[PDB]
């Protein structure tokens, strides 16, 4: 959840918002170790419920998200249902555990390609065009992350947009991402420079992957 | 319906068969003028019912077809239901009137392209990958005719097969067609040559479009 003013500005300027619970457990092995554990249900529930109680009157919020990269666990299913129960006015999405689980109203993969399948075990990233028409699948598809804009990038961006316009159920996506997470440091002359991972003696670190 | 020996041979050698009613009214304007007319229902029903009564014990016959190029009329809907009622063992298909009407269990277009839409009014030929995922659509797609093999042709055949293999619900199709409809004529010396439309004094005629 963002600083409270963000939503007011999105209401007044006009931007659709996905409001997202502060739950990410990416570093667990496997990813759902905590989110499938009922002992962590209370902590997770507060991060979802208190978000909804705070932000439910903002028109700019159109979709609730259960968080990010925390696999898929039974706690997600419980909290998916909690939101559906308390606020039927908004769809609920969540990408973890393969992007099309029972905890999401929207097929919302990250970096699924336009034409190319990536058949990873358990959590494949199907071509988005193919994903829509998998046996029994009916949901809309909106990428929670796509077109990774790291440095000299966005090659193939036009390919996504051509597909979005051709396929009714391909309803777009959210580019990753808006702004480089660089921080300002100062050299011996006092001149500013843009710093990334490692530049603060932080270790281990993932270098420029924050930009 | 074919010569009776054909089904026996397909049973024994092993070929899946679509058994098709002798109903085509292509030249009508519009194409469904007779097939939407209750006065033509009796003549139409016999072409369907007597086919079913004849061929229903052949294992090779796996799909019934209501005919070809006769638009979509209420008579198709009635006859579709008649088959479903008398023989639940086989799907019923029919391409007329847009290839995805209420008279077909299978989306069965002719000459729908792999990637390229052909948005004709009333009867569009969607990209086959797109067609599958149109809002609410769930059926399998098998082209009743594709890859028109007229003369020096079958360009882009590999594109179909790549798509058939990638998409579960794209289940193939039937090439148009097997054999040139050329006829033998003899020159002054009695030497045989291959004849087509118009070569018999027949007029009007459509020339080589039979090959
Ligand atoms: Na779209
Ligand atoms: Na990053
Ligand atoms: Na297939
Ligand atoms: Na022809």
What radius of gyration, in Å, describes the C-alpha atoms of chain A? Answer: 19
Which residue from B minimizes the CA distance to A171?
B135
Q: Is residue B116 annotated as part of the catalytic site, yes or no?
A: no
Q: Which of B117, B135, B169 sits opposite A169 (nearest CB)?
A: B135
Instruction: Give resolution in angstroms.
Output: 2.1
**Domain chopping of chain A, boundaries:** 1-211
Q: Is the preceding omega at residue B177 within 30 degrees of 0, hence cis? A: yes
Contact A130 B135 (CB under 8 A): no
CA–CA separation, A74 and A34 (whole Å): 10
Distance CA B171, CA B158 (A): 15
Q: Which of A18, A22, A1, A140 is nearest to A70 (CA)?
A: A22
Determine the distance separating the centroid of ligand 2 and the alpha carbon of A188, expressed in angstroms. 29
CA A70 and chain centroid, separation: 11
Q: Nearest CA to CA, how far is A116 from chain B (Å)?
A: 10
Q: How far apart are CA B67 and CA B92, in angstroms?
A: 11
Buried b (16+ CB within 10 A) or exposed e, A151-166: eeeeeeeeebeebbeb
Could you tell me the CA-to-CA distances from B190 to A164, B183, B186 in Å, in that order?
Answer: 63, 15, 5
Return the residue of B nearest to A116 by Cα: B166
Dist. CA B202–CA A131, nearest whole Å: 52
Residue A168, min C-alpha distance to chain B (Å):
7
- Which of B14, B15, B34 is CA-nearest to residue B24? B34
Kindly determine whether residue A166 and residue B117, on different chains, have CB atoms separated by under 8 Å: yes
Query: Do residues B23 and B17 make contact, with C-beta atoms less than 8 angstroms apart?
Result: no
Residue ranges of alpha helices (H) inside A155-206 are: 157-166
Rg of chain B over Cα atoms, rounded to whole angstroms, equals 19
* Helix count and strand count (H, E) for chain A: 5, 7
User: Which candidate, A81, A127, A85, places its Cα nearest to that of A101?
Assistant: A81
Pair B55, B7: CB distance under 8 Å = yes
Provide the CB-side half-sphere exposure for B40 (13 A, CA).
14
Cis peptide before A177 (omega within 30 of 0): yes
* Domain A1-211 annotated CATH 3.20.20.80: yes
């Amino acid at each position: 959840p963002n600083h409270p003013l963000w939503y007011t500005l999105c209401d007044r300027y006009g931007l659709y918002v996905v409001d997202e619970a502060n739950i990410e457990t990416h570093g667990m092995v496997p990813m759902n170790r905590l989110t499938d554990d009922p002992r962590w249900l209370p902590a997770m529930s507060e991060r979802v419920t208190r978000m909804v109680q705070r932000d439910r009157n903002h028109p700019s919020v159109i979709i609730w998200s259960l968080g990010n990269e925390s696999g898929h666990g039974a706690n997600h299913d419980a909290l998916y249902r909690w939101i559906k129960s308390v606020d039927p006015s908004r769809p609920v999405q969540y990408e973890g555990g393969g992007a099309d689980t029972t905890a999401t109203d929207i097929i919302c993969p990250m970096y699924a390609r336009v034409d190319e399948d990536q058949p990873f075990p358990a959590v494949p990233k199907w071509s988005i065009k193919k994903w829509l028409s998998l046996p029994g699948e009916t949901r809309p598809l909106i990428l929670c992350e796509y077109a990774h804009a790291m440095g000299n990038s966005l090659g193939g961006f036009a390919k996504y947009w051509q597909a979005f316009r051709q396929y009714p159920r391909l309803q777009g996506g959210f580019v990753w991402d808006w702004v480089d997470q660089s921080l300002i440091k100062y050299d011996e002359n006092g001149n500013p420079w843009s710093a990334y991972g490692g530049d603060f003696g932080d270790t281990p670190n993932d270098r420029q992957f924050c930009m």
